[PDB]
Amino acid sequence: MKKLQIAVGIIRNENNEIFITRRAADAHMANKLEFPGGKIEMGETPEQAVVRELQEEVGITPQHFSLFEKLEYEFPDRHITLWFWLVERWEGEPWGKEGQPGEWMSLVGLNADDFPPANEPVIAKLKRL
Ligand SMILES: Nc1nc2c([nH]c(=O)n2[C@H]2C[C@H](O)[C@@H](COP(=O)(O)O)O2)c(=O)[nH]1
Ligand SMILES: [Mg+2]
Numbered sequence: 001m002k003k004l005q006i007a008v009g010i011i012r013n014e015n016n017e018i019f020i021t022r023r024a025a026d027a028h029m030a031n032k033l034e035f036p037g038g039k040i041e042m043g044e045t046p047e048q049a050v051v052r053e054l055q056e057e058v059g060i061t062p063q064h065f066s067l068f069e070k071l072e073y074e075f076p077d078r079h080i081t082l083w084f085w086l087v088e089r090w091e092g093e094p095w096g097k098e099g100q101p102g103e104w105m106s107l108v109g110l111n112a113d114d115f116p117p118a119n120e121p122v123i124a125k126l127k128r129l
Contacts, residue, residue: 002078007050008037009057009064009085010107011094018087018107021100022114033114036098037085050085056097062090071122084122 010018022033036057040049054064068086094102112123 003074003081004079005041005046005049005081005083006038007040007046007053007083007085008035009050009054009087010035010068011058011062011064011087011090012107013090013104015104016106016108017104019090019094019102019104020107020110020115021098021102024100031114032116033111034100034116034119035102036094036096036100037083038098040083041081046083050083054096058090058094059096060090060092060094062094063088064090069122069125071119082119082122 010020012018018035020033020035023030037050037053038057040053042049044052058064064085064087066086066088068084070083072081074080107126108129110123110127112120112127115123
């Protein structure tokens, strides 16, 4: 009964663009362009898990809050929970502790190709805008 939760939040920049983590630099599998919000599982709740890890995945002080969407699926003998949170602003630069340097990119034109294909069902909704 192995289960693991993950909570993410696309940080909204000052130009209707959101900063995401593009596999940091490379480390193989560059098509895993993901966003901050990893490790909320630990022992928190869908509410404090992200809110708490947010500081750890943002570090800065951004007007960030609200959930855009949430995906709950369990792999063949695995339980992976992924919550997509919505962000409206962020002061300075996002650091927290995601571990994958990113840049301010327009979310309105996010690509399911650069990001992980295993998380398309979620993007399939926003991707179509
Ligand atoms: N957004 C997103 N999260 C994912 C994908 N695949 C995947 O294992 N995760 C999550 C679930 C796990 O709890 C966790 C494993 O790596 P971390 O320890 O770096 O968070 O990340 C994915 O394709 N998209
Ligand atoms: Mg974390």
